[PDB]
Design a protein around this ligand. Structure first.
Ligand SMILES: [Fe+3]
Ligand SMILES: [Fe+3]
Ligand SMILES: [Fe+3]
Ligand SMILES: [Mg+2]
Ligand SMILES: [Mg+2]
Lengths: 344, 344
């Protein structure tokens, strides 16, 4: 039993969405008025962000061929489930919201037709344009129909803290439709002072772009006001979570006159309803895993992911220390995710 | 012994700096053309950011009376040394660099005459305007000649990552003058998406404004370029340091080719020359302290501080768990700081 919570599929070409777009957007994209995203840095690994044996058609760090994924990932590792978390994140567009929203819908149509419908091991994400939270809510209502769709994907761009009350229609729609919430960094993710000055630094900063989302959701009452949502943060690490939990607890105890809508200790909200992917490895010893899980106070929090097809892919047979107890190992590799997605 | 690495003294009024200012800044400040900083949020603790029993003359979260510090902190605890870290950080001025630098200089004159020269337990910090690194370097040259001056303060404002090469004259001047480097957050410290929406969330975010300075300094070669410098990050916590060290090590291994100037593993750099204060408390058990020290791989890193006179003052007799070994406790309470400042 293995569930993979982070897999990056994509179209082969941006014009694959033209059949799904209404005019004028259809003509804008068909005639080349916008050519898509191009990450604002050079990858320093061979393979251009992917493993060396995976290329997408448009060059991005993704996979555009289901046959390649099935033959490299799904079948060889005998995955029970693989969560498609996308890669084309229209929330990265900072103007022309009507365009970003039409791209979000068109992308979800494309993935349902050429991915999710091809394999029962897939669990799908609703991609959205979070800059129009009401349109995003309507796309969530649209796509929650399909029983394999299980979460909404909230992309971490440069300028959005998702606990801002502007975004509440998104979480209300997610809850309404029995979908969970997932967070993933974009090519625009940054620290307080930018992405740094080199690729290696930009990549060190990815955890720093994501810890404020946990802090934001809790301080602004997102956990308290949608009790049926669980929240999964992918690819930001987990070794920092003891500190984020203890810190939030201290600030809650000292400052609760200011935040009376928080009705549990932040650490308790997190143990109950926050999940963090294990990928990428920090190359940590087995006894160090056990210590960190102790400090977290539970083994319910970690979910396995490979992050196929990216360069720092986590081999399922080597990422999770086998010295861990069997109950904990089963939780990390599949039970924690299974409970998150309401499976079995 | 006990050495306090974080104590916030200030002037009683900004006009106290007039006697040290040249024209036209002398007249600007004396006549009230600028009235100083005023933090952009309401404190939610009784005490306006301070202990309920300490009030500064200008209303800021600091202490302006040496007699009060001596009888509330220096004498009652038998402090061997106290590091005056300031509070008024002119780097927060984002224009009129000439004025900002004259204020740094004036402030340093004030502190030497009315604070440092009054008590041999004080270690002093050079306050600067980091927006003009060449002027900042001349002020470091000017003040380093006093023996109690032992470090330069690098304030963490909203928009400065100190690893950017523009800042190298500051590190060059520190190393040349045999001073160390300390970082402290300002009232302008923030995360990637601002300082949040509540005071409690702004306070949660402080460690997020400080972790990127460790990442910036290492990735951009500050550690390797200035091997005789030691770096202290204050008030950011320390439970996050294992993640930051592990992450940076991982990024280094997979991306050396981009950063050949980094001659040691980031974790080794940190174990040897990065220090972190223990304040404020996260309320964690002695057992858990020992596990975190395990995860950093040394007990050389932590330095005690009270952060007098702030609301989350750490009492020297209760902040450091007693189940830790006496060696570790001695290192934390004074020996790590003594070696950092070149004392005893
Ligand atoms: Fe991923
Ligand atoms: Fe990735
Ligand atoms: Fe403080
Ligand atoms: Mg000196
Ligand atoms: Mg305290």
């Amino acid at each position: 039993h293995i569930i993979d919570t982070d897999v990056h599929e994509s179209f082969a070409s941006l014009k694959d969405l033209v059949p799904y777009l209404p005019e004028p957007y259809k003509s804008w994209i068909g005639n080349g008025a916008w050519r898509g995203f191009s990450q604002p840095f050079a990858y320093t690994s061979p393979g251009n962000g992917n493993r060396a044996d995976v290329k997408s058609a448009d060059g991005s760090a993704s996979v555009s061929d289901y046959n390649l994924m099935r033959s490299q990932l799904l079948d060889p590792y005998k995955l029970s489930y693989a969560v498609l978390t996308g890669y084309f994140y229209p929330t990265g567009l900072k103007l022309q919201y009507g365009l970003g929203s039409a791209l979000a819908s068109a992308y979800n149509d494309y993935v349902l037709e050429h991915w999710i419908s091809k394999d029962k091991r897939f669990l799908g994400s609703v991609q959205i344009n979070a800059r129009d939270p009401e349109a995003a809510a309507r796309e969530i209502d649209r796509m929650a129909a399909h029983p394999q769709i299980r979460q909404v994907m909230l992309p971490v761009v440069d300028d959005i803290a998702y606990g801002h009350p502007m975004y509440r229609p998104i979480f209300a729609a997610a809850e309404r439709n029995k979908l969970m919430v997932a967070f993933h960094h974009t090519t625009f993710a940054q620290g307080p002072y930018g992405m740094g000055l080199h690729y290696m630094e930009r990549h060190c900063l990815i955890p720093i772009s994501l810890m404020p989302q946990v802090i934001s959701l809790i301080a602004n009452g997102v956990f308290d006001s949608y009790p049926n949502l669980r929240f999964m943060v992918l690819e930001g690490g987990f070794s920092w979570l003891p500190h984020v939990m203890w810190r939030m607890d201290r600030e809650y105890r000292q400052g609760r006159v200011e935040v009376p809508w928080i009705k549990k200790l932040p650490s308790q909200h997190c143990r109950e309803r926050l999940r963090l992917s294990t990928q990428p490895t920090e190359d940590i010893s087995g006894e160090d895993w056990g210590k960190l899980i102790d400090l977290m106070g539970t083994d319910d929090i970690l979910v396995f992911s490979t992050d196929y097809p990216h360069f720092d892919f986590d081999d399922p047979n080597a990422a999770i220390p086998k010295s861990l107890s069997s109950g904990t190992r089963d939780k990390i590799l599949w039970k924690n995710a299974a409970d998150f997605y309401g499976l079995d």
